[PDB]
Design a protein around this ligand. Sequence first.
Ligand SMILES: Nc1ncnc2c1ncn2[C@@H]1O[C@H](COP(=O)(O)OP(=O)(O)O)[C@@H](O)[C@H]1O
Ligand SMILES: [Mg+2]
Length: 1523
Amino acid sequence: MSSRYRELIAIFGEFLEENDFHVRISMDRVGEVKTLFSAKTIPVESETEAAIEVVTIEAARRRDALRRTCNAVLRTRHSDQHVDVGTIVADEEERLAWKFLIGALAAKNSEILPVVEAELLLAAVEYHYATARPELCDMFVHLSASEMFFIDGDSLFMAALSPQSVDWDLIQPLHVIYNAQKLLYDMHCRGARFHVVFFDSLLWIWESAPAKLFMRENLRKTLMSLSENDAKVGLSISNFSSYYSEAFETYVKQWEPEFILMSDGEQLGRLNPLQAFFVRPSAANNTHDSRRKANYTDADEANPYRLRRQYRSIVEDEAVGDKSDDDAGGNSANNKTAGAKKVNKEHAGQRNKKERSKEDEIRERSNVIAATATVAEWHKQMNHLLHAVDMSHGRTTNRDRDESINTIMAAIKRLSQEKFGKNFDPGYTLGGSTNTAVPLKLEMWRLLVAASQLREVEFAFAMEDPALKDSKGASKKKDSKSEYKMLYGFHVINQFVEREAVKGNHWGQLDPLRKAKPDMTIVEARSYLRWVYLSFVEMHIQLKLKCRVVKLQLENWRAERERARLAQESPKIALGIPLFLYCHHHVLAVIRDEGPRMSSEDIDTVRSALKHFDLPDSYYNKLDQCIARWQNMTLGTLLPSLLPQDKQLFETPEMLQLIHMGHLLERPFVREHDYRVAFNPDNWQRELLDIVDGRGSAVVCAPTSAGKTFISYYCMYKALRRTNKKVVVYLAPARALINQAVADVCARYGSKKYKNPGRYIYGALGGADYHQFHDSCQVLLTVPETFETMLLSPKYTDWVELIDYVILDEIHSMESNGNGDVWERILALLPCPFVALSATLGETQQLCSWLNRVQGRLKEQTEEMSGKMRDFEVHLLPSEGKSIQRWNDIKKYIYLPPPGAALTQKKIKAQYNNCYIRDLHPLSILTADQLQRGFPPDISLVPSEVVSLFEKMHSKFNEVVWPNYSSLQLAKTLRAQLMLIEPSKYFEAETYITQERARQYEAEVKNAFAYWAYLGHEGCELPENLVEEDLDDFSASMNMAVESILRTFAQKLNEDEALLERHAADGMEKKKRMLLRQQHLQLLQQQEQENEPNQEESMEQKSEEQGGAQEEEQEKETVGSVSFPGSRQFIREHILNVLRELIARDMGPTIVFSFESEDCGDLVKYVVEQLEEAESRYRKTNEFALYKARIERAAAAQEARRKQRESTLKQKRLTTGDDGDVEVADRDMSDGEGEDELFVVPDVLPEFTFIGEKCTVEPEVVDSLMEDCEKEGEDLLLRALQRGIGMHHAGVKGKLRAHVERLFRGRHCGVIFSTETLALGIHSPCRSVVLAGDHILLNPTQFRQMMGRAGRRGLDYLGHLVFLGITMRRIKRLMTSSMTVIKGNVQMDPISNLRLLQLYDFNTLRHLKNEAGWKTHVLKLAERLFVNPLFFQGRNSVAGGNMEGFTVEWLQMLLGYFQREGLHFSDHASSLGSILQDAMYVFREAHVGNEGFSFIRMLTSGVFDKAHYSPLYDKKLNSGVLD
Ligand SMILES: Nc1ncnc2c1ncn2[C@@H]1O[C@H](COP(=O)(O)OP(=O)(O)O)[C@@H](O)[C@H]1O
Ligand SMILES: [Mg+2]
């Protein structure tokens, strides 16, 4: 204590004038010191914001750095002999150390500068390397790689020469370079990179030990790759130099966006040569792009590094370099607890979320086989019956056909009051109230059609397809009128007439042939014929009301074009489109249908509008013509164009067809499909269903919005409807937890009754419901591990055989970010037909082979009986294709504020963009990318992507004329394609609108674009020239050709992708660097103000030295001090404003994605803050004073009327006698009870456009959910929720979080803040998707779940993904990447094989008989396991291929290692144990061959005959650690 603080002063004063300690008593010029440190290195003060936090943020982790810079300065400022002495400050020696400094700084003012500045710039680069703790990632695989990756070789060489950590193996006499080859052959072989290696050198700095052992490898790999190929040689390398140094490597580094792999440091130090000149690149990188650094650790695959932490800018200098618990709880405490709670389980799940509809379920009980008999027990002639049976129970005819006709009454009565309507007068618009009406009315009579305008007569069969037609046209042709039907409706009498006629055969022999004759004029002959009259009443009734829409759309669309024609241009066709698409929707009905005239109705109305709408003739004759076949069964021909019947043009900048294509998003989607069992839905089902109806395997790819999961509950429909005794199973995306709520909710579209326990669903292990209820039920819901144990697991075997049928979710999403071993196990083993669920998988074939294989192996094992029928595995893509990414397009447009703005913003105010969302147009459309990648995901959309791109492509690959497309047939090889892409884009579904088949154009024109790129920017490498067949390939003009189309790429391309994330992204960083530098113009100048020249013994200024310098901007504020792009909590300031403007472009619900957990809470908090603020800014007597006035005044008056009536009623008194004249009290009591008139002060306007506009759910329950939360209040969810801020994150109770989710789906709330889970095993409606940060992890894996999100189910036309969007480039590295592709793991695992061992040897324990059954089950099991054998990455390991057996060399080593081991249990004295010798009594007889050569079942037979037994105790207790 004392002694050490007597010491340190005596070291100091020797250097320079004695005492610091009292020369001066303070100083106090601290102020000099503190400037000098921080303006380089960080650590001086414990920097305080509002407050320092827990004071181990900057006690512990500060005082390292603080007393580092302290010591390492003073030791260097002790020079004049020694830098050989250490200076270490204690506590009270901090102040001392500073007094020692300040009185040395102003002592000389020359020597001081280098010994500080240099020491600083050294130590800074030391700390920058040390900035750190590290990460553990993981493996290599995730970011290793698409794309441009480098490793600079110097590093490469030292990676081979790296090891102790095992002294180097294999005796070789300095041929070592095999190392390089090995690593190359690892990560190209089963990875991508696109790899580049620099050799960035002479770095070296060798000898530190005799070398080199350099240029050997340099010249080697040079020669290898520049052979040109050899299939072992390629990577590829460049030259350069100049050492490290940038101003060389810049031009490269920019152009091909990458990330980096490099080796600072072990050891071998020496000091300055290594650490210095490697570290400083790292800094450089981070203050360019920013890129990031890895490695030199122990890769292949996973390593270190460092990231996404904020940098010190600038700081540089090159100047080195240099030349029982399931049981007993059911007994003790079960006196009354209370009396069971379980009643609080079932109830919860049975009130749980409502969303979707139904198909048939009722209680069933029976086991069904088919056979019927007389059971009377004869009749045995027909003359023993004569006449047999008659009408009775015929009341099912009587009433039902009365009711039928009573429809046509009501229908045409409702028609009456409508048809005349508000009869039209030219010109008034929009007026016209009944514009609204007919659209509603239409929907009504569509809802109604099922069972009270069509059948009470069965349908029946739905026949074969033409039957509906040919039995219709007949009926009309007997009746005098062309279109029979509605006017004078009811005509079921002349039906009966006709039906009796045509005697021999009743209806003539055509139709009863195809029906396989049922009833002659009895049941079926009536039931059918009825229903085909009758659909065609309903049909024509509606069809007329569709006419009446497109009819009066004429009028509303008149002045819409014409008034605005004068304006500048001639519109509306960007708003005039619904005319056309309505006229489409109308005539869309005809698909089987008899025309409803053309002399009144449909066609006449359509025609008048259509030639008025601009369309010159030619389009005319395509209309009637094609549809003529459809019409006919009815109609004649066509009017001439002559004789008033056309109208004014806009046309030609358009032409006909084009008018559609430019303006609109969204097309039909025609049903017709399956009508007994159905949804309808939209083809995918019409394939999928037929598999499960077999029984089988398969999987469905489906890129999301995807529809995937819900279609699996045909399994549950089968096992429930019919002989319920078999389990259906749904296996989760796993634990935690997300599966559970959805799984539960689905299955409770229809519970079902039983006898004594019985019971419907058991779950678990979880994170809800939680461990047990295990067993009894029909259908299950667990996770991989739970199910596994339940299988092997020897007492649960009973269950296994009763499982038909097992489906398990997600697929791709789990495969990547898991845990993608456990999967393989459960598709190798034991009964099922399976459905399985995946979004996109880029490798086809590879998947399907593995599957189909292991199906055939199951079939094999079940022999000789085989299966009942199926195996086989099917594999649904089957290809245009795409599923519900065809359904709607998703625009991506991204966040970037205009540099320099205000913030807060808020409400009841003018607004525009401003908003940071802008446009985008997908990042990169390029020359270089297209060569390799041509043309990658994610892109699709039309129109306005590839539409006007055509106009470019078609004007400049054809107008070349003709400079080197003339060698060889190149020019025509292109022009044979180009021209033809235009008709194929339209005339798939000509006449009205293309199907949805404007999609197909994208794939068409992908043959245009990518093909050119496979000529390209590169020479003869692609297409690869010399091969005889003609495109090129035998042109030496290939080079020329390549560079003719090189020109023809760039010119058109870069206009469209218009560089938003470059332009103002650099603007923001420009602002950042005018912001940061203004901080150094504060402190520098301020140091002179702190002392002031109101002081000091030098010439007076009287404080004319004050303020900043020297090129001057008004002092430091922008969008904030801390603007600070790509940084955290940047973000929040603008997120409020993003939101508010998305409500005031989009209108839908809004999800916000983030990383869970502290972060998500910080976000929520800040927004609640802002709103509470703005409420304080309304209530303080601005507009508010006026508002409250009214509401207060009128309330008074209300409650005074209460007292008014209370007076006049309280009279006093009827008097008509005496002399008072007439009066009777109380005669007026007609008024009245009134409520509530208002009072508000919780919240008004600033929160009321923040939360959703339109909503649902009666207020009672909403309030009561809030009420619950309030009691146990966690986050103060009670505050956040009611202010519109949804949440869903960890650290929230199950009851509370559950309340949130209902109210987002209920469309009560407007926003929600949560993590990535809500796109996975939970679901919500979305429209504007918001993403906060690109940190700390993304793969295109967990991107593409949220990518296709929005475009809601039958609702929204557009998804919107707004990115934040921290980095500059990484948009590209999400989008432009091709595909998340399978690449699994296994069985080879020790633990698996130990489990299998002990399973077999448990039945070996006392009690054999069943030995037979057991062992042959073990044979089957042994085959079933190791099914291929050998799965995915295991053939890239040590086997090759597909090999196995292979258990032998492991087995034997483990065999004499199981039980030798001392007392075992534990270290306590014998007995327990004394057995330690059992593993020598099985070794010799298992090493006969080593057991002992090829073929599966000789392995396990060899292992029938171990023992392989522990002392009992140990190996059991291994197996029971795991479970
Ligand atoms: N064939 C269909 N036609 C129209 N809407 C459908 C159809 N099938 C499903 N939907 C709807 O779309 C919604 C989203 O589909 P969904 O199956 O939940 O998602 P996922 O792709 O995650 O499996 C469902 O909630 C349902 O409303
Ligand atoms: Mg799903």
